Amino acid sequence: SVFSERTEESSAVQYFQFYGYLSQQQNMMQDYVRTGTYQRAILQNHTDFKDKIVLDVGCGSGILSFFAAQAGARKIYAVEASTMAQHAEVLVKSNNLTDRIVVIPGKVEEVSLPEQVDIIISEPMGYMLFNERMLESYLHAKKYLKPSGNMFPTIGDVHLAPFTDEQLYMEQFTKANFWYQPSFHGVDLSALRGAAVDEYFRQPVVDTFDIRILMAKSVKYTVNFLEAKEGDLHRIEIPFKFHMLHSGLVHGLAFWFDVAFIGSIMTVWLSTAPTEPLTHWYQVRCLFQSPLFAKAGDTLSGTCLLIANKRQSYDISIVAQVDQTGSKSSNLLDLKNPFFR
Amino acid sequence: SVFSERTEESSAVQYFQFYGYLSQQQNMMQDYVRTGTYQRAILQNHTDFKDKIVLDVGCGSGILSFFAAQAGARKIYAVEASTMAQHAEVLVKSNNLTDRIVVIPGKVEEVSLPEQVDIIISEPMGYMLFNERMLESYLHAKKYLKPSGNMFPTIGDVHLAPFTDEQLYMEQFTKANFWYQPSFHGVDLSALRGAAVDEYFRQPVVDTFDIRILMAKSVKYTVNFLEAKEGDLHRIEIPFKFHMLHSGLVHGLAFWFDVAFIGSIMTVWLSTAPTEPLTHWYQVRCLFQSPLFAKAGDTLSGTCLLIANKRQSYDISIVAQVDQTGSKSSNLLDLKNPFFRYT
Amino acid sequence: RSVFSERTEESSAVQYFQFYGYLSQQQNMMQDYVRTGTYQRAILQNHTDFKDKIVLDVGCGSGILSFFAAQAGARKIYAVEASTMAQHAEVLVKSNNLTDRIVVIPGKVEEVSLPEQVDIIISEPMGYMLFNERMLESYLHAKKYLKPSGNMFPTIGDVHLAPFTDEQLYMEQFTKANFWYQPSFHGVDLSALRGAAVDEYFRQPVVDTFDIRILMAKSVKYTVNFLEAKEGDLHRIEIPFKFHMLHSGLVHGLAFWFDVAFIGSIMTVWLSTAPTEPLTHWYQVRCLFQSPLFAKAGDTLSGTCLLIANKRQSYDISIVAQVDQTGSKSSNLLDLKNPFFRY
Amino acid sequence: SVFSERTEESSAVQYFQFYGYLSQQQNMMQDYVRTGTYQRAILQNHTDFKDKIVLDVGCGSGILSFFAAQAGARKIYAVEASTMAQHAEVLVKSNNLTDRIVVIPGKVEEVSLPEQVDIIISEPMGYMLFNERMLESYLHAKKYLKPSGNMFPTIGDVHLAPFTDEQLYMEQFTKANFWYQPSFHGVDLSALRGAAVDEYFRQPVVDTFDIRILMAKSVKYTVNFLEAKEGDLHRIEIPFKFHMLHSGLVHGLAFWFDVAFIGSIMTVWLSTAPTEPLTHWYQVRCLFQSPLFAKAGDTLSGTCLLIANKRQSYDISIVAQVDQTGSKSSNLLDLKNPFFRYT
């Protein structure tokens, strides 16, 4: 199947075991911004659901399917590959919605649906939008979408911006500096200092921060889920040109994302921006091993290259240069292994 | 191999990926109690190493092998199955010990070692001593040990003691009761509350605690690594009879462990007890489904049965009863997926 | 031919005596009230050691100590000064009507001819970490003019050293060096010099003061007796130390200060630059390890601080320190002539 | 050599020791205005470098030579007399430019270059442009310049303007009046007050200031590096006639400088004016011993005479008079020892 061909079994085992825990489903459900904004997107656009056929990709507890049922959907196919599928069925029955929500256990790349659907709903967003590679499952599911059918969410915007944060940089460098020791219990570790810096700086930093650390207006990269093919997400090239608003050290790039539910009645946005209330996605920062100095008015140009890997994540390459000085940084990050700060 | 036969590949992949991180090796190395005590055990028993042949099972960074070298070992075979083996090789070279330390990449169950050794060293201990099932690799390695040989550590003691912790017990329900509401954004979640409770109780709790929650002297189960066969660790039956020192509600069993290095000069102990400075192993607590009331002077008797599984861990079966009242409780827990509660 | 020129590069000496030829630098020392007031107290409280005696003031600067000796009743004071300040001292002697008692002799004390032997030598020859500037050798050299029965003011000098923890200072210095880790400074890869940069920054002793709570063990004391010592004794100063750690943590280096004692006939007067005492223009001095050492309370930190005199009127400092229980060792080289004034 | 003949060894030793520190090179490199403007001048005039032969006089770290290489230079001879030369060589190798950059250790007055060059680059500017006398080394290097050749920078403009700053002027006496006391620890210091005043006024003041303290449009003195000979810088006579824009007391002259890189594509300016972002050169102020009252519309005429000395600096003589009143003041300053006032 498309899923198995792009995924190491070890990764998939761990992945679906994770989502098989009620505590993890609870953790997502209790993100009120997320869950509440999905409910608002679906109910405020009830006409996009009324008497329609719906596909919920990765239904987990079933919560989004219940929202579709509230909005008047005729039939909702709720596809879920983890053992959580059986718990969703328990809820469908206990909520007397067996006539409207049909749980389909399995991977959306592998199951058979009885009919085409009018609209697909999902919450496939990971850290930095793309982690977990579930957007590919979401896009894959369009094989079941009627022509002119809709996608909720409809588009995704990734935002990137340069930041200054000496404390974070030193925090990571300090951890790496353990391997600088020439006599740890009598052992010279220093030959590994380079490998250690590489490893620590390969970790994207997941937390939030004060917006005043951003040194330029963000650059936007948009994925249109109505138009995109899953293949489009195997190699994501994001060029950027920042006009520096402040002088200082650029320690790296900060990432966040918005998704929009573009319904018939209104467009509803779910944002993970640092200007907005915190979600369980927080924000993500990719550190440079060495910061770049820029003055206000300079331009910081480069590319963020995301290569999907078989562990359901991405290999991140960031290259950035201050155009006026040729000061350049290149970095490699492993999105699967973030530092939760 | 013996390893592959007892381990699901997925588990092994994740396991050795974990130890391939310098950050995880560092985490262990910076546990000063652990690393310092190993060093002390090896150096203070230098006559057990001087001019000897040594096997380091799962050498990681190589640190214990460097200690064996500090103690004068003639030759050290350092076996390591994760990619960390290449970093250990770098350190052996940079510390000018290529004549003394040989890194062997691979599983100790699978590699070829050329000769028998005088002593095996290893740090194979997991949570509750047995988690990760690496003690079996350690014992397996005795195929390379001379009959007169030694094991460092030489013995391992797992300690169990009953505890009272009302807040810990109540917490499970507080979390599970998320599901006990009729209209979460319009949805009745209550049908899943029992399943949520069950899930939380299946998780051993990793953190530390005030020793004043302990209600009796611990019961000790000793593995003698010189005498034990790896097969001895597939099923570990730990009967216990606690002589209650305090009256109250027993909410479960607390676990910790000690290991001893029994050398020619002295015995050195490494302890993860809650009476000792904290280590990266913390301690482990397993809840009963229902607390048991016990009076000071009562006896709390039963069994903790640890059944090895192919996820490099154990299923923990606990049965306990107050002998004087006949009140009984049990739990079955999954050690592979503990709840890390520590703050 | 002179002892001074034989041990001193001309460049260093020119700069050195130019520095002290400035009235502003003399003013700076004079306005150190602890220093100047304590010298005055030492001399006046021991006036019977000066009354009707012959005095040599080694490096008189403005003449201030010679004026104190005159206040204490000295019969004749030879005030030797090699910088152009000698001419300003002469002006003050005349304007204070002390021409019959204070005789300024311009030149280096190693090179001038004095008319008679003296009863007592006074000087302020102490530099940073006591020994910087190597003026203590000039002070000791001057003993060729001292009567067998003679005294030295100050009489002894105590150097104190203690381990300290200060993550912020360490990080502050490393941050400066990290400039040289850049792979693309305006397009230029600087990183090949990162090692040289770290060495250079960490070679700088840090002159400032600090909270005594950063100290992790009781100080070790090294005493120089100026009555007994010979010049040659200061070419190589070896200070062994063994610290009993009172606190657990990272040792980022050794902190240094010094006391001198004026051992007079009436009383002993102490001038201290300790961090427990009011600040002086000597502040205190800290020598960083390039890599900190972890120690727990009860551990011992042992090693040697070796000072090798150099021709730039200072010392090459080698500090080697080891945590005895673990063999964790740090070795560092500092250039005392060029400290980082952080205050 | 020309260098040794004009420089006291003592000065030269200290001077090249200073530039041998990576931290000092770093200090200059991190002056973004300076470094960035050099890079811009070189890169925006790439046709002056593309496939050309270049001489870098005093390359330090090598940074300007790397800029010349970025601009496409065929060959760059990078001359450096301090031990920094060894580090520059490390950078040339690590940046894979050994085929294009040749580091030549030594003084430019003493080394041999294998061929003539098309363009000379340097950053030889000191305080008030001329301090350090490195401009003479820059001009000396033209012995290697082709008749076709260019100089980057091409011209240097020193600007001078009268300023009012009552607080700066009064500060000198506040400091000097330390000596105006009859009993400093019993000593009458007053006889040295005049010498102290003289000493403070002999120091040019390095810092920055509000442009509103300037009382007239600056007068400019231009050195054309294409045309000037070394000898032209031994005696620099700068006549001035200021037309006062503001009425008030003139406390002295403020100095700054600009350099221009006059390339084939464009002229690029590097300015240290008080109207521009600050550089590590700040600005320099020389006080008059006595301020001069001038009315708006009055003229302040005189001369600033800079006499080179063998300490790689200048003796500054300033004489000024208000033409309408005949009120006159002067000062003699020592540029080698400025007072760094900036905070």
Ligand SMILES: Nc1ncnc2c1ncn2[C@@H]1O[C@H](CSCC[C@H](N)C(=O)O)[C@@H](O)[C@H]1O
């Ligand atoms: N290819 C795939 N096919 C089916 N389910 C998948 C899948 N990839 C991920 N999933 C499931 O998708 C869910 C993502 S978490 C979102 C859960 C729920 N829709 C909510 O919004 O609360 C998980 O339960 C995961 O097991």
Ligand SMILES: Nc1ncnc2c1ncn2[C@@H]1O[C@H](CSCC[C@H](N)C(=O)O)[C@@H](O)[C@H]1O
């Ligand atoms: N069967 C096996 N064969 C070889 N190495 C193994 C193994 N089981 C576990 N390991 C390795 O054993 C190590 C356990 S962690 C101990 C590391 C190091 N000896 C120290 O004391 O710091 C890990 O690096 C793990 O990869």
Ligand SMILES: Nc1ncnc2c1ncn2[C@@H]1O[C@H](CSCC[C@H](N)C(=O)O)[C@@H](O)[C@H]1O
């Ligand atoms: N070898 C030497 N011979 C003579 N003077 C020397 C000397 N070495 C140092 N000096 C002088 O000693 C002085 C040290 S500073 C102390 C000055 C003064 N005695 C006071 O206590 O305030 C300086 O003026 C310095 O020039």
Ligand SMILES: Nc1ncnc2c1ncn2[C@@H]1O[C@H](CSCC[C@H](N)C(=O)O)[C@@H](O)[C@H]1O
């Ligand atoms: N006569 C001379 N010959 C060679 N190098 C000299 C010199 N006079 C000064 N220098 C060197 O010139 C440098 C001046 S500082 C400028 C350094 C570098 N070009 C930069 O722009 O960053 C110092 O390193 C100093 O040692």
